[PDB]
Design a protein around this ligand. Structure first.
Ligand SMILES: N[C@@H](CC(=O)O)C(=O)O
Length: 287
């Protein structure tokens, strides 16, 4: 039976203070799109000259960026968001090259200019905004708990003393580190590994974005999502800190798809297992 490479039982730590998830920089405010098409096209001239948009994500995140088992094609909500950016740059969604990244590599890939954008369920936080830039919010998720249907776990305090799996490099870890008494924290490279670990009964529960958890439930209907909202997860397109022009450009793409029906279509395609489509997230601008 398979075993995820890189599984670590983390050293026990005292709980973090409850306000460790505070987000007081107003992190979700971003830059207004360009007023003219000429300004927008100039901001992406270097991408156009390279002939493709280079997008950081992975191919193992069900519903968001994965390989379709019927068609063999790379697909999902995040893949489609990235393709809409490419459509605005090139005229059609199909000039994209992917760089495969883990959750723990999203910031460094941007710092090192190894991708143009990261579209990989990337929560916008004050801490991350010191290192990278972000578009406006394109999907608002919330952290919850995934457990087998025969588990009595239904609330956060039930995680105390139990084995909870988290992918390294995620906001999900910080929130689990606030639980008192602590769970046993087991960390892995990606959320698909947590699913394997739960299937093999090496852990008791997984806690992350309900969107990501829904993709795991789709693969294993013996599991269900429980508990209250544990932490807001506002997704943004990650961009190099200094490429403010690309921030404005991507924010133009998001204005387009929020208002022309495409956002609604993408939610209905990928996320209806969580319920009826909400209104698209309202963008917030600093300027
Ligand atoms: N959205 C959360 C969880 C994840 O992306 O895996 C984060 O940005 O860390």
């Amino acid at each position: 039976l398979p075993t995820p490479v890189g599984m670590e039982i983390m050293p026990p730590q005292p709980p973090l203070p409850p306000d460790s998830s505070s987000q007081d920089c107003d992190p979700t405010a971003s830059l207004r799109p360009f007023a003219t098409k000429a300004e927008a096209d100039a901001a992406v001239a270097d991408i156009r000259a390279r002939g493709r948009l280079i997008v950081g994500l992975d191919i193992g995140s069900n519903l968001f960026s994965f390989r379709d088992p019927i068609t063999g094609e790379i697909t999902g909500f995040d893949v489609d968001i990235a393709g809409e950016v490419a459509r605005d740059i090139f005229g059609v969604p199909s000039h994209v090259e992917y760089r495969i990244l883990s959750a723990a590599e999203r910031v460094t890939a941007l710092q090192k200019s190894q991708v143009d954008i990261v579209v990989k369920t990337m929560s916008i936080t004050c801490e991350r905004r010191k290192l990278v830039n972000f578009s406006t919010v394109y999907l608002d998720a919330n952290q919850r708990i995934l457990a087998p249907r025969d588990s009595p776990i239904t609330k956060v305090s039930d995680l105390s003393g139990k084995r909870v799996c988290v992918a390294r490099g995620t906001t999900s870890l910080r929130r689990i580190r606030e639980i008192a008494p602590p769970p046993v924290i087991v960390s892995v490279v990606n959320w698909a590994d947590c699913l394997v670990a739960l299937q093999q009964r090496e852990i008791d529960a997984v806690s992350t974005d309900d969107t990501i958890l829904a993709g795991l439930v789709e693969e294993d209907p013996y599991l269900h999502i429980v508990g209250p909202d544990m932490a807001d997860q506002p997704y943004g397109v990650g961009i190099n800190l200094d490429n403010t022009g690309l921030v404005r450009f991507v924010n133009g793409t998001l204005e387009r798809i929020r208002n022309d029906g495409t956002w609604n279509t993408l939610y209905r395609k990928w996320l209806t297992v969580l319920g009826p489509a909400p209104a698209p997230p309202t963008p917030r601008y600093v300027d």
